[PDB]
Design a protein around this ligand. Structure first.
Ligand SMILES: CCCCCCCCCCCCCCCCCC(=O)OC[C@H](COP(=O)(O)OCCN)OC(=O)CCCCCCCCCCCCCCCCC
Ligand SMILES: O[C@@H](COc1cccc2ncccc12)CN1CCN([C@@H]2c3ccccc3[C@@H]3[C@H](c4ccccc42)C3(F)F)CC1
Ligand SMILES: O[C@@H](COc1cccc2ncccc12)CN1CCN([C@@H]2c3ccccc3[C@@H]3[C@H](c4ccccc42)C3(F)F)CC1
Ligand SMILES: CC(C)CCC[C@@H](C)[C@H]1CC[C@H]2[C@@H]3CC=C4C[C@@H](O)CC[C@]4(C)[C@H]3CC[C@]12C
Ligand SMILES: CC(C)CCC[C@@H](C)[C@H]1CC[C@H]2[C@@H]3CC=C4C[C@@H](O)CC[C@]4(C)[C@H]3CC[C@]12C
Ligand SMILES: CC(C)CCC[C@@H](C)[C@H]1CC[C@H]2[C@@H]3CC=C4C[C@@H](O)CC[C@]4(C)[C@H]3CC[C@]12C
Ligand SMILES: CC(C)CCC[C@@H](C)[C@H]1CC[C@H]2[C@@H]3CC=C4C[C@@H](O)CC[C@]4(C)[C@H]3CC[C@]12C
Ligand SMILES: CC(C)CCC[C@@H](C)[C@H]1CC[C@H]2[C@@H]3CC=C4C[C@@H](O)CC[C@]4(C)[C@H]3CC[C@]12C
Ligand SMILES: CC(C)CCC[C@@H](C)[C@H]1CC[C@H]2[C@@H]3CC=C4C[C@@H](O)CC[C@]4(C)[C@H]3CC[C@]12C
Ligand SMILES: CC(C)CCC[C@@H](C)[C@H]1CC[C@H]2[C@@H]3CC=C4C[C@@H](O)CC[C@]4(C)[C@H]3CC[C@]12C
Ligand SMILES: CC(=O)N[C@@H]1[C@@H](O)[C@H](O)[C@@H](CO)O[C@H]1O
Ligand SMILES: CC(=O)N[C@@H]1[C@@H](O)[C@H](O)[C@@H](CO)O[C@H]1O
Ligand SMILES: *[C@@H]1O[C@H](CO)[C@@H](O)[C@H](O)[C@H]1NC(C)=O
Lengths: 225, 220, 1182
């Protein structure tokens, strides 16, 4: 069994430095290199650099010289990069993988760490603003009706949105959170039968456990407004 | 740097037949040795990227015999044989034999190959609490469509707008195997009280005319 | 027969136990320097290996700065220096630890031997003469010498080296189990066969310098038999049978030497096969594991080297327990003698001290038997008394009781029953030192110490002044000859000094007894073989000494029996006759019977000696260049199999190159085994052929040459048996082995220095400046393994002869009670080489330490300069490892090769001696077939004026013009006096010499021009003492006429004319009864009859009879005269004699003096002329 596994996910502010660790466990740690790579959101994996893992002789990429620095710890069998001089562009998911030293470059990176993410923030905690969304006043013609409720402006992730606190699972299309202006935005919707609404009561229950905020807005039909 | 270009961006594979991915270099990966190095990794969602095919023809110890490599020069191919439900990840192809940029490939997801379908577009008006707070936020849902080829477009009173807009696509369903997405226009309050015809465009490959949905503000 | 471990160290103080307890810890700390050296070597090769992979990755980036290929390589350069300090630490901390390891064991076991040696000699000297009668003297002397040398080598330095080998073993396995364990278990699976082969090779190595005189000793006995008596061999024509007798046993010794050489060299070759096959197995599994990414190359090198040197150290720790295994047996033989307590204890001082002693005495019923000869009781029930001044004498039976009471007076034995009491006081309650202080004795045959005259008087008493000595030697009637002395009393007298007469030593011995000032003077047969002209003056001297002492004279010349006071006679061990002279005359007993009866090297010549076996030398040197050239092949294969890992490559290319190089290790192992076996076998055969052929040729050319060559004291039987026994096997080591050494070393270092100037030269100049010291390291370690202790024992010979000189004549010392002088004479002569051995231990320890310290500083300096030279890209790491491996391991290999062979200087001086012996040719060549070879059968020998002097000394002319003619058939006899040389013309008849002026006219013909083998074919000789051989009596008798076809019937005939024929028939296995030390021993008369029968086998025309006196049987005289009278009838005889019972039937007797016949004629004529013959009849008639 060979297993590299890594730290936890970060939530660091802009300008600070972060240390992320790759605890190699299950092999003879003092031969193989350790290669640190970076994957952005939906892009090709770039390559940052490696460490000699016997005497700490490092080699960086060209773009990442200076704003990264690696260090080893042979006793605990880990490897670190202390990632100074943060920008917004350095929010990614970072992996570690090993290369043997007797026949490196002529062998693949045979085992990879699980990879854990770095999230550069610039603001502080803010409450969500749960708005409900009604069907359009005017035309109501279809035998299937769609109900949604928007959550805008919160920070930071996650938010547990659930219609009726878990009694409705018939088309809840919960969407991923979208970043804009360093403020997240989630949305969600469900399609129910035409005979259910507004004849029955239904609502979502937004909970934001990062700020202990639990809001329960009941949707209403658009009448005069 | 060999500027690698793995060039399917997705692969609509069914469940129980053959799949085929490319991997196309930008300089020939023949070393002075008689060997061609480029390797093939499976990356499951969330977990660590595993190794499946290395040194294009060989096979790593542990992976089943459904996998096979091919090709030489500047064109390479992995071949799944009779795909199960367990091989659904994203596949990419290191490397450069001209180090140390050490390039990697783009990636290729997989699919479950639904039959074609049409979206059910829905526009929701701005909420009354957003009318009290002082912004506009109009949201368009459109659900249960296949495949993932769409370009939604927002048009106000017959005039286009490509600023202040979001898009969020969900991923593949494991119960019906379809997609859905959303767009949201976001601006100030006073922009909302100048127009009536708020429209959307559903440019899907399964129709010629885009499915337009609309509502008018001044009546309710 | 061995002692326990806690007994051998019982003669150690506390400084010796401190020396051993520090030497053990220094042995263990020196034990674990080599596994730690391999650990730091593995860690360094790991550093150099890791940096190299990074070099190429960097190499493909073209814009990379020089400071870049400095930082990775700067780090390599900086790390190297800390390991240079590690190596200098191990070197300077093994220097002082090896110095404490060697110096504190040679000291602590030279001190115990220097105590045990003098305590053993003191234990020998304080023993009973009865115990000394049972044990041998030569066995005891050899016991002293070789047993104390074995106890010196058994605890000397072997135990510290044993602890070092065991500590290296344990350090090797601890490093092998804590660095990486799978490879250690793999090599430990084949560990027992490795240790077994190393143990066999170590037993071969430590027992290298050993002469092996067990194969040759049959021929050695043949040579020491024949060369002990050479005058007989030339006379009887004994050449071809003697050479065949030598030749067969020599062939057997050749065959045994062949098998020993083949076994020794296959035992060396199997060890190198196991070394290289273990290299192949361990690197095949090591690069199965390092290509799986589990170890590195550092851990593979470290656990492989450390487990290998562990298995070979338990290999080499076996003979150092063998030496302690047999020193346990030698210490029993020493400690049992030093354990025993004598019953009389002549060193103890507890008895009485009488004063005013006069010498009253009483024998009271003594019943005594010998403790050696137990079965017969000689004395019983004796009762004799004496008063003051009464000179008692005793006469009677022969040798029974004449000596037992003269020994019992000094208390040499206790009586088993009875109690002799001196002056009414017990003899066993006096202090025995004081008891032997008051009684003097003069022995029958006096032995004299090889010292000066005055020092021989000094043994009488150590407080005497020279005035007393001078008045004693004038008092004892000895001053006449001693005033004709060269300078003074410092005159060297002895068997190596002036060869004196028996009466002179006799009267100086009574003079020593007079300086003792005895009170009960004893005399036992002071006229054993003394002439009548000296017995009168020594009798006069002892008659001057008789006034005032209780004298007991027991001697011959039964005339002072008249002047004696009281006489007694032996009767079956009970003396019952007592009375004065005329009273014994009227008793008419045995005394009446007495008065009735009496009254350039040139090394090409040494190889030119072996010009017949060049089809062995060609395959020998063609095999030796191959066998001494595969050390650079091992260096290049080791360098490539490590340099395949300091480069980046595929996995499969690395796998197949490692498989190829492990295969080349196994192929090199099989080739090295085959070439060691053949280089052993062919030089073994071409050495033993020259030993056999050179021994046969030197024996043929040594037997042939003249009689005068055997007369010089540099050609003795001992020296010639040494130069025949020891020198063929020392010319065998200057023809083949020297060529093997030169060709192995010239391949082993020419190939190394040539390829190490090809690859990297700035390192090999440095290593070539170091190489002589590490070659000397190899040679001094190989001197330590076998030959260190052997040299020292030849130096100690000052006390080597004092002990054997004072243990032979032990009876003289115990009579004198002067043991303390001999003990201090031993003590100071032992005190000087003890200090010399301590200085040699303080030299050998420091030289053996400094060579090892240079051996580790070679690693340090070489790899530091190698790292600097690598970090500027002009040598790779594999080339630095190649240069180091060649020009270090080749230097250790030429050290071990140049010391493993035998020496050259002793070999070339032995070759010069053999080449100067085997080619020289005398004038009387005994193999010259040329000559007249006539048919003469009458034999008229006519001398005419022969003038002769011996070549051993030209200072005394002995023959002055002798003319002598013998008539046919008559028995012409010749008798003379002392110093005249009665047998000179007797030896000259066989041409044993050649006189200067004059000639022999054998029927008018000179012996110069005859054919010598014809002359020996018609000539028979009788010797004084016969020379008997280790064959049957049929060939001892049939020896009389060699080169013949003599059969059983003439042996029967010569037995008829011998009167031993029915004596042969009285013996079982009649002619087959082998005689010797393996057979029976005969009396003088029977061996005389053997000689006469042997000479009379030939049936010659002329006989030569040469007889001497001092026979003790004296009853076979009539039978040897009747066989001579069977020969005095038709065979011309020449007779000398000492018994004058042949002067009547001899025909023409001659007086010989001044080289001239005094007078011709018969017996009555020369007796009536009142010449010297009148004097001999007047002497022997009284
Ligand atoms: C696993 C073994 C790893 C070590 C390899 C050793 C190989 C042993 C094979 C025999 C080698 C040899 O011939 O030398 C042994 C020698 C025995 O001496 P010997 O003349 O035969 O008789 C003495 C009786 N006490 O020498 C001796 O006196 C025996 C002592 C040798 C050194 C100790 C090795 C013994 C085994 C380790 C200690 C004991 C632990 C096992 C129980
Ligand atoms: O010289 C010392 C110090 O050892 C070293 C120290 C530091 C560095 C070294 N580097 C290389 C080699 C040795 C190094 C080692 N002696 C060298 C000589 N051995 C001798 C010896 C003698 C003749 C031929 C071959 C051998 C070799 C081993 C061996 C086995 C059984 C009995 C004796 C020996 C063998 F038959 F296989 C003993 C140890
Ligand atoms: O010189 C060589 C070859 O020896 C000869 C070559 C040619 C001819 C010869 N002729 C006669 C005698 C020897 C000859 C011998 N050294 C002797 C010293 N070794 C030492 C050594 C030391 C102690 C115990 C065992 C060993 C043996 C080998 C070894 C391995 C690694 C490091 C050092 C050594 C080992 F651990 F297995 C090296 C080879
Ligand atoms: C000047 C003299 C007296 C000092 C002698 C220095 C020697 C004995 C010392 C100096 C450096 C020491 C080494 C330091 C580090 C190591 C590595 C460790 O894991 C095993 C022991 C080992 C290998 C030590 C062995 C003993 C050592 C070699
Ligand atoms: C004295 C000799 C004849 C006894 C036999 C010893 C040799 C031939 C045997 C004993 C133990 C064996 C080893 C035991 C373990 C393995 C693991 C295997 O996966 C590779 C081969 C290897 C390394 C074997 C090689 C052969 C081996 C070393
Ligand atoms: C007597 C002791 C030393 C055991 C000796 C074992 C030797 C003879 C045997 C055991 C295993 C063998 C190896 C097995 C496999 C091969 C692969 C071949 O392509 C090269 C030779 C090589 C590498 C052999 C070398 C010889 C070898 C090492
Ligand atoms: C390239 C040239 C210089 C290499 C020549 C090698 C020479 C210098 C070396 C290699 C082995 C050496 C020999 C090794 C052994 C001995 C035995 C000694 O009792 C006499 C010197 C002698 C015979 C040496 C003479 C010089 C020698 C022959
Ligand atoms: C390139 C030239 C300088 C090489 C010359 C090599 C000379 C300087 C060295 C190398 C090996 C040395 C020999 C190595 C071993 C011994 C054996 C010893 O019992 C006598 C000295 C002797 C014979 C040395 C003499 C000098 C020597 C021959
Ligand atoms: C008379 C000549 C041969 C000197 C004998 C002692 C030599 C062999 C030993 C004793 C001290 C040792 C030195 C100890 C310290 C170091 C410093 C290091 O940075 C280089 C090696 C070096 C310099 C060692 C080289 C070898 C050395 C000089
Ligand atoms: C025999 C005598 C005269 C010389 C012996 C010492 C020689 C063999 C060795 C001992 C240590 C070695 C030195 C080790 C350290 C360095 C410092 C490095 O930056 C240059 C090389 C240099 C200077 C080496 C030159 C050779 C050297 C001095
Ligand atoms: C600028 C430059 O020389 N780059 C070298 C190139 O020549 C070589 O073809 C390649 C393959 O080894 O490695 C790099
Ligand atoms: C990233 C980097 O610069 N690495 C090395 C560094 O050891 C050295 O300081 C430098 C000199 O400019 O060149 C190179
Ligand atoms: C790298 O490139 C620059 C200019 O392109 C040049 O100045 C520099 O010397 C180069 N470095 C080396 C080691 O050539």
């Amino acid at each position: 069994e060979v297993q590299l596994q890594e730290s936890g996910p970060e939530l660091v502010k802009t300008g600070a430095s972060v240390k992320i660790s790759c605890k190699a466990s299950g092999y003879s740690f003092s031969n193989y290199y350790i290669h640190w790579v970076k994957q952005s959101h939906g892009k090709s994996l770039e390559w940052i650099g490696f460490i000699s893992c016997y005497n700490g002789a490092t080699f960086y990429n060209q773009k990442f010289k200076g704003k990264a620095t690696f260090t080893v710890d042979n006793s605990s069998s880990t490897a670190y990069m202390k990632f100074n001089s943060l920008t917004f562009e350095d929010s990614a998911v970072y992996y570690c993988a090993r290369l043997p030293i007797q026949f490196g470059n002529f062998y693949p990176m045979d085992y990879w760490g699980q990879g854990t993410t770095v999230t550069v923030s610039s603001a502080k905690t803010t409450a969500p603003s749960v708005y409900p969304l009604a069907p359009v006043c005017g035309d109501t013609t279809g035998s299937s009706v769609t109900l949604g409720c928007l959550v805008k402006g919160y920070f930071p992730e996650p938010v547990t949105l659930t219609w009726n606190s878990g009694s409705l699972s018939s088309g809840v299309h919960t969407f991923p959170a979208v970043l804009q202006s360093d403020l997240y935005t989630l949305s969600s919707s469900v399609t129910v039968t035409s005979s259910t609404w507004p004849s029955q009561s239904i609502t979502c229950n937004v909970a934001h456990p990062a700020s202990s905020t639990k809001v329960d807005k009941k949707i209403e039909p658009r009448g005069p407004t | 740097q060999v500027v690698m270009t793995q060039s399917p961006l997705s692969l609509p594979v069914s469940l129980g037949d053959q799949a085929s991915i490319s991997c196309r270099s930008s300089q020939s990966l023949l070393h002075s040795n008689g060997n061609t190095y480029l390797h093939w990794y499976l990356q499951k969602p969330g977990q660590s990227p595993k190794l499946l095919i290395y040194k294009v023809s060989n096979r790593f110890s542990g992976v089943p015999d459904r996998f096979s490599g091919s090709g030489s020069g500047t064109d390479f191919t992995l071949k799944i044989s009779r795909v199960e439900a367990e091989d659904l990840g994203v596949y990419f192809c290191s490397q450069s034999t001209h180090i140390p940029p050490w390039t990697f490939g783009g990636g290729t997801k997989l699919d479950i190959k639904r039959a074609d379908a049409a979206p059910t577009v829905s526009i929701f008006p701005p909420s009354s609490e957003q009318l009290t707070s002082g912004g506009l936020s109009v949201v368009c849902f459109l659900n249960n469509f296949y495949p993932k080829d769409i370009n939604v477009k927002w048009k106000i009173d017959g005039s286009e707008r490509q600023n202040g807009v979001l898009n969020s696509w969900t991923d593949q369903d494991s119960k019906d195997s379809t997609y859905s997405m959303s767009s949201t226009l976001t601006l100030t309050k006073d922009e909302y009280e100048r127009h009536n015809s708020y429209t959307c465009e559903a440019t899907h490959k399964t129709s010629t005319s885009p499915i337009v949905k609309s509502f008018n503000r001044n009546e309710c | 027969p061995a002692v326990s471990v806690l007994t051998m160290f019982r003669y150690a103080g506390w400084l010796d136990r401190l020396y051993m307890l520090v030497g053990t810890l220094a042995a263990i700390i020196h034990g674990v320097a080599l596994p730690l050296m391999m650990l730091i070597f593995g860690e360094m090769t790991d550093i150099f290996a890791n940096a190299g992979n990074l070099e190429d990755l960097m190499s493909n980036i073209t814009n990379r700065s020089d400071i870049n290929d400095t930082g990775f390589f700067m780090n390599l350069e900086e790390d190297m220096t800390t390991y240079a300090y590690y190596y200098t630490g191990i070197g300077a901390g093994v220097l002082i630890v090896a110095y404490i390891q060697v110096s504190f064991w040679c000291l602590a076991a030279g001190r115990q031997i220097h105590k045990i040696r003098q305590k053993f000699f003191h234990a020998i000297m304080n023993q009973e003469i009865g115990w000394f009668d049972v044990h041998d003297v030569g066995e005891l002397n050899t016991r002293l010498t070789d047993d104390v040398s074995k106890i010196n080598e058994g605890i000397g330095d072997k135990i510290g080296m044993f602890f070092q080998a065991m500590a290296t073993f344990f350090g090797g396995f601890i490093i092998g189990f804590t660095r990486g364990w799978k490879l250690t278990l793999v090599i430990l699976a084949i560990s027992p066969v490795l240790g077994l082969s190393a143990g066999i090779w170590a037993k071969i190595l430590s027992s290298f310098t050993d002469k092996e005189l067990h194969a040759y000793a049959k021929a050695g006995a043949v040579a020491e038999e024949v060369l002990a008596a050479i005058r007989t061999v030339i006379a009887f024509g004994g050449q071809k049978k003697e050479l065949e007798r030598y030749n067969n046993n020599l062939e057997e010794a050749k065959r045994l030497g062949i098998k020993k050489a083949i076994t020794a060299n296959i035992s060396m070759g199997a060890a190198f096969l196991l070394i290289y096959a273990s290299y192949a197995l361990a690197f095949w599994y090591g690069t199965t594991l390092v290509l799986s990414g589990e170890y590195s190359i550092g851990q593979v090198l470290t656990v492989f080297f450390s487990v290998l040197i562990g298995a070979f150290s338990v290999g080499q720790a076996s003979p150092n327990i063998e030496a302690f295994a047999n020193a346990r047996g030698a210490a029993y033989e020493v400690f049992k003698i030093i354990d025993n307590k004598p019953s009389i204890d002549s060193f103890s001082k507890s008895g009485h001290k009488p004063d005013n002693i006069q010498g009253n005495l009483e024998f009271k019923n003594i019943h005594f038997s010998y403790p050696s000869r137990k079965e017969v009781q000689i004395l019983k029930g004796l009762n004799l008394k004496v008063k003051s001044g009464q000179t008692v004498a005793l006469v009677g039976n022969s040798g029974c009781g004449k000596s037992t009471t003269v020994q019992l007076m000094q208390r040499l034995y206790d009586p088993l029953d009875g109690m002799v009491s001196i002056d009414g006081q017990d003899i066993r309650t006096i202090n025995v030192r004081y008891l032997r202080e008051i009684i003097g004795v003069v022995s029958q045959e006096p032995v004299l110490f090889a010292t000066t005259i005055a020092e021989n008087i000094r043994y009488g008493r150590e407080d005497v002044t020279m005035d007393e000595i001078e008045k004693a030697v004038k008092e004892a009637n000895a001053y006449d000859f001693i005033m004709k002395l060269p300078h003074q009393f410092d005159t060297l007298v002895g068997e190596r000094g002036a060869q004196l007469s028996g009466g002179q030593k006799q009267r100086i011995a009574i003079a020593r007894a007079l300086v003792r000032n005895p009170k009960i003077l004893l005399l036992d047969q002071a006229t054993s073989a003394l002439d009548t002209e000296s017995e009168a003056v020594v009798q006069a001297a002892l008659d001057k000494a008789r006034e005032g002492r209780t004298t007991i004279v027991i001697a011959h010349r039964l005339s002072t029996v008249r002047n004696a006071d009281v006489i007694a006679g032996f009767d079956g061990g009970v003396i019952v006759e007592q009375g004065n002279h005329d009273e014994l005359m009227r008793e008419k007993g045995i005394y009446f019977k007495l008065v009735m009866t009496q009254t350039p090297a040139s090394f090409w010549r040494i190889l030119k000696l072996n010009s017949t076996e060049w089809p062995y030398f060609v395959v020998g040197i063609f095999c030796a260049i191959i066998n001494g050239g595969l050390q650079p092949a091992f260096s290049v294969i080791f360098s490539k199999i490590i340099g395949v890992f300091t480069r980046i490559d595929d996995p499969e290319t690395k796998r197949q190159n490692s498989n190829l190089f492990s295969l080349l290790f196994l192929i090199l192992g099989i080739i090295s085994f085959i070439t060691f076996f053949l280089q052993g076998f062919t030089f073994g055969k071409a050495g033993e052929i020259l030993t056999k052929r050179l021994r046969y040729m030197v024996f043929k050319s040594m037997l042939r040459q003249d009689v005068s060559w055997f007369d010089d004291p540099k050609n003795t039987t001992g020296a010639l048996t040494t130069r025949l026994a020891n020198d063929a096997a020392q010319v065998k080591g200057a023809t083949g082995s020297r060529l093997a050494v030169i060709f192995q070393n010239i391949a082993n270092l020419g190939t190394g220095i040539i390829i190490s100037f090809i690859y990297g030269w700035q390192l090999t100049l440095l290593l070539l400046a170091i190489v002589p010291i590490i070659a000397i390291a190899g040679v001094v370690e190989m001197k330590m393994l076998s030959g260190q202790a052997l040299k020292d024992k030849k130096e100690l010979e000052g006390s080597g002869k004092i002990a054997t000189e004072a243990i032979e004549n032990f009876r003289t010392v115990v009579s004198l009670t002067r043991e303390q002088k001999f003990e201090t004479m031993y003590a100071q002569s032992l005190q000087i080489p003890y200090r010399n051995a301590m200085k040699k231990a303080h030299v050998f320890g420091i030289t053996f330490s400094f060579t090892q310290a240079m051996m580790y500083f070679s690693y340090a300096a070489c790899f530091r300069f190698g790292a600097y030279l690598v970090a500027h890209k002009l040598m790779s790491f594999e080339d630095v490892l190649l240069v180091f491996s060649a020009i270090v391991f080749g230097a250790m290999a030429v050290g071990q090769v140049s010391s493993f062979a035998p020496d050259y200087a002793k070999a070339t001086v032995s070759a010069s001696h053999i080449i100067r012996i085997i080619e020289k040719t005398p004038e009387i060549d005994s193999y010259s077939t040329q000559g007249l070879k006539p048919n003469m059968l009458e034999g008229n020998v006519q001398f005419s004026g022969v003038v002769f002097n011996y070549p051993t000394r030209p200072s005394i002319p002995v023959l002055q013009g002798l003319s002598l003619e013998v008539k046919k058939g008559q028995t012409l006899a010749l008798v003379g006096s002392s110093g005249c040389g009665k047998s000179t013309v007797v030896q000259l008849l066989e041409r044993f010499y050649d006189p200067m002026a004059g000639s022999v006219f054998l029927d008018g013909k000179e012996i110069k021009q005859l054919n010598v083998q014809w002359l020996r074919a018609q000539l028979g000789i009788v010797s004084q003492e016969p020379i008997l051989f280790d064959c049957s009596i049929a060939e001892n008798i049939a020896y009389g006429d060699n080169s013949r076809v003599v059969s059983y019937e003439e042996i029967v005939r010569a037995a008829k004319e011998a009167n031993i024929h029915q004596f042969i028939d009285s013996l079982p296995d009649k002619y087959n009864t082998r005689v010797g030390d393996k057979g029976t021993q005969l009396s003088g008369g029977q061996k005389q009859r053997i000689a006469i029968a042997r000479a009379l086998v030939r049936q010659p025309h002329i006989l030569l009879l040469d007889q001497a006196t001092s026979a003790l049987d004296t009853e076979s005289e009539k039978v040897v005269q009747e066989a001579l009278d069977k020969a005095r009838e038709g065979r011309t005889c020449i007779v000398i004699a000492h018994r004058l019972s042949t002067i009547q039937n001899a025909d023409l007797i001659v007086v010989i003096q001044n080289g001239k016949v005094k007078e011709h004629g018969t017996h009555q004529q020369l007796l009536a002329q009142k010449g010297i013959y009148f004097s001999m009849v007047s002497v022997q008639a009284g």
